[PDB]
């Protein structure tokens, strides 16, 4: 019923701007404060500002005094945030969230939009480079490094899905406008290298596939 609809994600260019949107439903948009909050990877929430859509009274954090502009269109029940002159610093998830009927008193941040992963990057669709990770030496943990691709995501499997348990695939990291992740798999010592183990990486966005057999260093 009460619902906050933000677009899933947005790719922005280092220098450009973006108008994030947050669409209210289930109650009267003009009667509750919207707040905008920034969150990064494993970091705190950072409160940007708030807007009363019934009044247009808006308060901003000093930090974001010249970064964000809050706006509303009451006829489409949408609060907007405008972010200006973007840098990687601004790459984050941004949430709109619903406050109280009142300034601070009788309410909660009781409802939140899904968030919008804003990604600042100058990259074009770039396929991945995949590197085998063998150990330097019970059981043995191989892996492969998927480096320098864009955009998210990739799909890694091992022996075309044949090895399933013992597979860990970690979150991407954004370094120099490009994504990196890694996958590992643990297999019995003797099995490998006698039997082959191969990561099959694939990038949907570039329609590229790279298989990579792991061999002892």
């Amino acid at each position: 019923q009460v619902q906050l609809q933000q677009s899933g994600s947005e790719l922005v260019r280092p220098g450009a701007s973006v108008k994030l949107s947050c669409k209210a439903s289930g109650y009267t948009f003009t009667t509750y404060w919207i707040h905008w909050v920034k969150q990064r990877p494993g970091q705190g929430l950072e409160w940007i500002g708030t807007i009363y859509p019934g009044s247009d009274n808006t308060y901003y954090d000093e930090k974001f005094k010249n970064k964000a502009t809050l706006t509303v269109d009451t006829s489409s029940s949408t609060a907007f945030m405008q972010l200006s002159s973007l840098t990687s610093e601004d790459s984050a998830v941004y949430f709109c969230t619903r406050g109280s009927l009142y300034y601070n008193n009788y309410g909660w941040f009781g409802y939140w939009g899904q968030g919008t992963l804003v990604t600042v990057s100058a990259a074009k669709t770039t396929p991945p480079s995949v590197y085998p990770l063998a150990p330097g030496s019970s059981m043995v943990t191989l892996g492969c490094l998927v480096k320098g691709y864009f955009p998210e995501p990739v799909t890694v499997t091992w022996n075309s899905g044949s090895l399933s348990s013992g597979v860990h695939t970690f979150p991407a990291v954004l370094q120099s406008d490009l994504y990196t992740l890694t996958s590992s798999v643990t297999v019995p010592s003797s099995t490998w290298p006698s039997q082959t183990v191969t990561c099959n990486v694939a990038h949907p966005a570039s329609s590229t596939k790279v298989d990579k057999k792991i061999v002892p260093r």
Binding site: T141, T180, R217
Partner: protein, 212 residues
């Protein structure tokens, strides 16, 4: 310019009572701060537990009680449940603005504690052929889901070219994470021993490799 700080991370068994605190660096926290507590859960799911200092939002279990203890705001869980594992964020209001604490990570012990499996891979000669050297440190199967990663080279510590993904939940309810050390190939061949150390529950796991 007011900094709100919470306890970094706290641990507790099911049934226990625990208190998260929320400190203001402006001074004492009063009701005039309308301390709100909000909870974050995997897949960025937020729930507003307490507003107006001690006002529970409807439906929220009794378990949770907002309170002022001394000079600090406080959230208390009385009969902590396993589903309470979460980041908890307090927020305080100040002359028109809100500020969020950095958040406490709460672990309600669902299973015995578990030390990470660390694995340190060296760079592949393929990456090396592109004049790059990435060391990858994989950390899995830890509980509580709270670690800090450090890297050392030939003894001395690193603060350049390090990245660690935030610990994410494995399907057995333990956690995993990865940490990277990106350097030049030049630099990699200039040093001998490389080390990856995860601290966890007041002790340290360390994998390292010497250069061949």
């Amino acid at each position: 310019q007011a900094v709100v700080t919470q306890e970094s991370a706290l641990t507790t068994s099911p049934g226990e009572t625990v208190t998260l605190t929320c400190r203001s660096s402006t001074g004492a926290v009063t009701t005039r701060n309308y301390a709100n507590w909000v909870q974050e859960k995997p897949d960025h799911f937020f729930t507003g537990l307490i507003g107006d200092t001690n006002n529970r939002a409807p439906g929220v279990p009794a378990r949770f009680s907002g309170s002022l203890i001394g000079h600090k705001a406080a959230l208390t869980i009385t009969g902590a449940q396993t589903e309470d594992e979460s980041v908890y964020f307090c927020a305080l209001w100040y002359s028109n603005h809100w500020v969020f604490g950095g958040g406490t990570k709460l672990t309600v012990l669902g299973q015995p504690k578990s030390s990470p499996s660390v694995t340190l891979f060296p760079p592949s000669s393929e990456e090396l052929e592109t004049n790059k050297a990435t060391l990858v440190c994989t950390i899995t199967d830890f509980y509580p889901g709270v670690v800090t990663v450090d890297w050392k080279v030939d003894g001395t510590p690193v603060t350049q070219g390090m990245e660690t993904t935030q610990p994410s939940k494995q399907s057995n309810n333990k956690y995993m994470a990865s940490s990277y050390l990106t350097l030049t190939a030049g630099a990699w061949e200039r040093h001998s021993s490389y080390s990856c150390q995860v601290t966890h529950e007041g002790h340290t796991v360390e994998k390292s490799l010497s250069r061949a």
